[PDB]
Amino acid sequence: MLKFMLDTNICIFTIKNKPASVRERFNLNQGRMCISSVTLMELIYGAEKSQMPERNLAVIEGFVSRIDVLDYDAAAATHTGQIRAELARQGRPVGPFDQMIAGHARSRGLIIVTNNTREFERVGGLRTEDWS
């Protein structure tokens, strides 16, 4: 029943600003959303370096407790290695965390939900949606 994988940019976008349009998109697709553990790494890092780590970790816990967190396994690392090579043949620069997140979704046949679709635009074999 898993269908969407939320990238890091859409999580920061949602946690900081709490948009109304995202709230209705979450309530309708509840039970079919997830994030890669790479995104969990970035969220935890942001809380630990902030000025109120315990308060911010509490908000992350309520966010994480409503979705699934997928482990970055051998298949995800395999697709990420192929994508990094596919991107090298062109002049397309992509961030290392975003590369791993994209290959993770492709290894599971999931749709990337993101904040700005133009950075996942150049990867072949995966679908993206803009929930901004």
Partner: protein, 67 residues
């Protein structure tokens, strides 16, 4: 033939007195486990509690800092 006697299946419930009872429109409810607590929401309104509260400090993730 020969069969067995058993007891029906139970489960752990919480009671809501009338001062904190849920409205009549909700017959199905979503439950979420946050640490030691649990959150009881209507079926299609699971995120409303997390959106209307649970604020983060203004400096949280102002810079993603991805190399």
């Amino acid at each position: 033939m020969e069969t067995t006697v058993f007891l029906s299946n139970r489960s752990q419930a919480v009671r809501l007195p009338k001062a904190v009872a849920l409205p009549e429109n909700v017959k199905r409810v979503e439950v979420i486990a946050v640490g030691r607590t649990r959150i009881i929401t209507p079926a299609g309104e699971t995120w409303d509690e997390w959106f209307d509260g649970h604020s983060v400090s203004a400096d949280f993730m102002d810079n993603r800092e991805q190399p």
